[PDB]
């Protein structure tokens, strides 16, 4: 889901 991509971007900026 394209809609999920920015959630992962957000997550990998955290860690």
């Amino acid at each position: 889901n394209w809609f999920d991509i920015t959630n992962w971007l957000w997550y990998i900026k955290k860690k």
Partner: antibody, heavy 127, light 109 residues
């Protein structure tokens, strides 16, 4: 606070191409999804497609695939919708919309749903 | 493609009445990725509910969303004068996002 400001109304000839712009301020431009939604006069909302600027990844609704281009310019925080081969049925108000975020501020976890809307751009296809 | 059905397309209700608006999906909506928007004439849509039941800050708590899978409901506990407007559901559980056709809540007299 996130603010989306669109270019002004435009009259376009049948068969021509229109470019609509959406300039964003506040929040993050590159890491949140920006979509375009249109509304023909007296009709409902229709999602057309979107872009994630950091990754230059677009996502088009099948019924517009081959007739639209969405692009993003990080230097100006501006997104663009191109719609080609215009017909009278393309007369509509075109909205840009950016997904919301959770928590305080505007740099939180994205929510997918469209919290932030431009003011709309009326595109009238006419001779 | 997920087709969202909002029926009826119009509801005539009295000020102060409770409103329940249905949104039914042609197939299960992934991760309850279902939103509701309000739109008044001449204005841009406004987000009321996301993720089926989550309410952004600033949105009045008389608006509540419920449901899962294919069956979703927007409830307005008590209609204020500004609540007479058009309401859209939207699913974003697939890369192809779609809207319902909208339900106009108008004043019964």
């Amino acid at each position: 606070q996130v603010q989306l400001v669109q270019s002004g109304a435009e009259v376009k000839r049948p068969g021509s191409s229109v470019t609509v712009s959406c300039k964003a301020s506040g929040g993050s431009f590159s890491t949140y999804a920006l979509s375009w939604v249109r509304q023909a006069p007296g009709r409902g909302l229709e999602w057309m497609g979107g872009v994630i600027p950091l990754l230059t990844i677009t996502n088009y609704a099948p019924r517009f695939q081959g007739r639209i281009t969405i692009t993003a310019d990080r230097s100006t925080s501006t997104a663009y919708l191109e719609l080609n081969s215009l017909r009278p049925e393309d007369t509509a108000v075109y909205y840009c919309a950016r997904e919301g975020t959770t928590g305080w501020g505007w740099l939180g976890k994205p929510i997918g749903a469209f919290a932030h809307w431009g003011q709309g751009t009326l595109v009238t296809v006419s001779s | 493609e997920i087709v969202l059905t909002q029926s009826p397309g119009t509801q005539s209700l009295s000020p102060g009445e409770r409103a329940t608006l249905s949104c039914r999906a042609s197939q299960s909506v992934g991760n309850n990725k279902l939103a509701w928007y309000q739109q008044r004439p001449g204005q841009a849509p406004r987000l009321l509910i996301y993720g089926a039941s989550s309410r952004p800050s600033g949105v009045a708590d008389r608006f509540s969303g419920s449901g899962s899978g294919t069956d979703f409901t927007l409830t307005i506990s008590r209609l204020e004068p500004e609540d007479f407007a058009v309401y859209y559901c939207q699913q974003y559980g697939q890369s192809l996002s779609t809207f319902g056709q909208g339900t106009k809540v108008e004043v019964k007299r």
